[PDB]
Write a protein that binds this ligand. Structure first.
Ligand SMILES: O=c1[nH]c(=O)c2[nH]c(=O)[nH]c2[nH]1
Ligand SMILES: O=c1[nH]c(=O)c2[nH]c(=O)[nH]c2[nH]1
Lengths: 153, 153
């Protein structure tokens, strides 16, 4: 038994007045997101010198198209993940020489564009290996269920 | 289109040499975990004065059974989520009067036991509403896929 099933098993024994069924899916959702981020995605970003969430900024700017420049608001709306601390991430990336601030726009530098062009290839290869245990149909069904859950929020 | 599908759509246009299919499921996994934690679960914990991750410590101690006392190692292995900073969470909970340190064991106080007995009821009710958009079968299928993905790590 994994953490979530063992936990639900203990609750049914200790608090039988409770219906702890919902704990499994949401506990596995949070643990999977945490373990994959911590042990799979972020070490790869770290090989490229990218902190948690800095990849998203570079990736969002790159896939917007030349000249790879977005307002900070467009940058937030087009981000893959709605995490916070966007001002401090742009600051960090500017000190590293990967973004600059034109006009208000945030723009990939040439070094930033090359970095993300390299990183995204290794990223998607890393992602497929993260999902290799799921079949193509299992991945698509998992993307459907996550969309339905996410729309419901 | 959600964030993940719009992002994949942009990549297929900007980097057609890439296969960005894996981005949807893992982007939706991370965004769903983040939005549910931020906008659904943690505000409820906050109503009870519980910081992110402090609920897990109390819940783990409670469902272990009387006298609700575990070693910090048993506490980590039985946690629902393998998040870090466990020493600083036990410190925080001890200053609040919800855990104490017997012998090395971490133990719910009476106030801590009552708090988690109250919180867990509101927690599971809150969780069902988080998952209300999914059918009982959709939730079970989502728990199966997340287990397969999590075992594969
Ligand atoms: O275009 C992106 N694809 C991802 O898979 C991803 N992940 C992330 O954190 N940011 C982005 N951006
Ligand atoms: O027994 C638990 N159930 C949960 O649903 C949960 N969530 C969390 O953070 N800790 C715990 N513990």
């Amino acid at each position: 038994m994994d953490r979530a099933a063992h936990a639900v098993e203990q609750w049914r024994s200790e608090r039988p007045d409770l219906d702890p069924s919902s704990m499994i899916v949401l506990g596995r959702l949070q643990e999977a997101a945490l373990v994959i981020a911590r042990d799979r995605l972020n070490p790869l970003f770290a090989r490229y010198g990218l902190q948690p969430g800095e990849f998203d900024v570079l990736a969002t700017l790159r896939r917007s198209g030349a000249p790879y420049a977005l307002t900070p608001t467009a940058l937030y709306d087009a981000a893959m993940i709605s995490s916070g601390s966007m001002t401090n991430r742009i600051d960090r990336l500017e000190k590293a020489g990967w973004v600059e601030r034109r006009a208000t726009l945030v723009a990939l530098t040439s070094a930033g564009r090359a970095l993300i062009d390299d990183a995204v290839v290794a990223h998607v290869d890393n992602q497929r290996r993260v999902l290799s245990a799921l079949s193509a149909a299992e991945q698509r069904q998992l993307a459907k269920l996550l969309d339905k859950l996410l729309q419901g929020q």
